[PDB]
Amino acid sequence: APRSVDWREKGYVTPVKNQGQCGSCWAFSATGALEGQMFRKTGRLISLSEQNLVDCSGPQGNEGCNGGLMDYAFQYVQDNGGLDSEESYPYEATEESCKYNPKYSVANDTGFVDIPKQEKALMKAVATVGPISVAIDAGHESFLFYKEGIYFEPDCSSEDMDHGVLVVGYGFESTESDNNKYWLVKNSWGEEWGMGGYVKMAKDRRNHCGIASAASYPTV
Ligand SMILES: *C(=N)C1(NC(=O)[C@@H]2C[C@@H](S(=O)(=O)c3ccccc3Cl)CN2C(=O)C2(c3ccc(C(F)(F)F)cc3)CC2)CC1
């Protein structure tokens, strides 16, 4: 595979948002992956409605501002026959009545692929598919207050992931350390957090923070 990947340079990735006080990380992860695959399909980048997912995907198992799964969001889009744009169904950072309108749907999916649970498979998916939804353990102060560089938290769990984010690339950073390989990860805590809203997460260090434990993307 390529020595490094960054899908932002190729037009696959919308701006970073701030999810606010709503536990909608999973919705931003899901829209990010679908934004990427819709772009691959059509050559058009359109910001999708997280609010549509928050309000409408309870029947697939999601829990609005108390959390959810990206694969449940992909299942909703398939079941529903569509997903509205941000413009037509803007973000409120609350749980509201479903107001999905099919005329304003700008995306679809045909299911989703769960990537085998190894960092090598994740790399090869990132290299070829586009941005990938992933689960991480974000429950450490070191992550809350990350600013820059390659993130490594010795207390990170590879199983207790609690935050959905989007891998948009990977690389090898020459720091002359045991912490050179990274995943390039889009968060939903605004541009002021980390490196313009992004974090470089330790790669090939025994599935650090569970980044390869629940990786997936929608098929379109
Ligand atoms: C985001 N603001 C926040 N986190 C979540 O909703 C996260 C997102 C996923 S995950 O990426 O952590 C994950 C974990 C394990 C397997 C697959 C995935 Cl995608 C889930 N989650 C959780 O915190 C989690 C959870 C939450 C809700 C549900 C539901 F039933 F579907 F609603 C399942 C699992 C504990 C794992 C903080 C809210």
Side-chain angles (χ1 to χ4, degrees):
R3 74 184 270 237
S4 70
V5 174
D6 183 354
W7 288 112
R8 294 175 303 178
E9 81 193 341
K10 298 197 166 166
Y12 280 65
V13 187
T14 61
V16 174
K17 272 77 66 174
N18 194 329
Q19 68 187 70
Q21 300 299 295
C22 168
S24 53
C25 59
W26 61 270
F28 285 90
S29 181
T31 58
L34 193 50
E35 280 160 2
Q37 290 310 284
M38 288 305 303
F39 182 75
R40 166 69 55 86
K41 183 184 218 272
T42 74
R44 288 176 286 273
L45 187 68
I46 305 171
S47 175
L48 300 178
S49 176
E50 293 80 17
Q51 195 64 44
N52 189 162
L53 290 178
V54 161
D55 294 348
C56 307
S57 63
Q60 288 78 19
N62 289 328
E63 299 289 345
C65 287
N66 302 123
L69 299 169
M70 292 79 82
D71 288 353
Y72 290 173
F74 304 144
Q75 194 62 58
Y76 167 78
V77 174
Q78 186 177 19
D79 291 349
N80 193 52
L83 188 65
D84 288 334
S85 67
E86 179 63 30
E87 189 173 321
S88 72
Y89 202 153
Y91 190 56
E92 311 194 60
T94 56
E95 290 166 7
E96 303 302 331
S97 73
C98 182
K99 298 169 282 283
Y100 174 79
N101 198 302
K103 194 175 192 165
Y104 306 135
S105 174
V106 292
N108 290 99
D109 68 49
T110 56
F112 53 87
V113 169
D114 291 335
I115 296 161
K117 301 182 187 309
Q118 287 87 35
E119 283 183 280
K120 181 68 71 180
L122 175 61
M123 169 164 78
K124 293 174 66 184
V126 174
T128 58
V129 172
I132 300 302
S133 297
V134 300
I136 60 170
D137 175 4
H140 296 95
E141 293 175 320
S142 58
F143 190 82
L144 302 182
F145 297 106
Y146 169 82
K147 296 195 67 54
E148 72 194 8
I150 303 190
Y151 182 73
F152 181 83
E153 167 53 63
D155 294 348
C156 232
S157 170
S158 59
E159 306 203 70
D160 301 355
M161 296 85 57
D162 64 0
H163 193 58
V165 292
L166 188 69
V167 174
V168 304
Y170 64 79
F172 182 108
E173 192 147 298
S174 187
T175 70
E176 202 162 65
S177 86
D178 63 333
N179 198 33
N180 285 7
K181 300 177 176 171
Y182 69 89
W183 297 113
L184 181 55
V185 171
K186 190 187 190 200
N187 203 353
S188 49
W189 292 347
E191 273 184 34
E192 67 80 38
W193 182 85
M195 299 185 73
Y198 291 78
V199 53
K200 293 170 181 172
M201 301 272 311
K203 173 170 173 288
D204 299 321
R205 301 198 59 178
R206 294 188 180 185
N207 189 15
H208 194 59
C209 301
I211 197 152
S213 299
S216 68
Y217 61 93
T219 53
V220 298

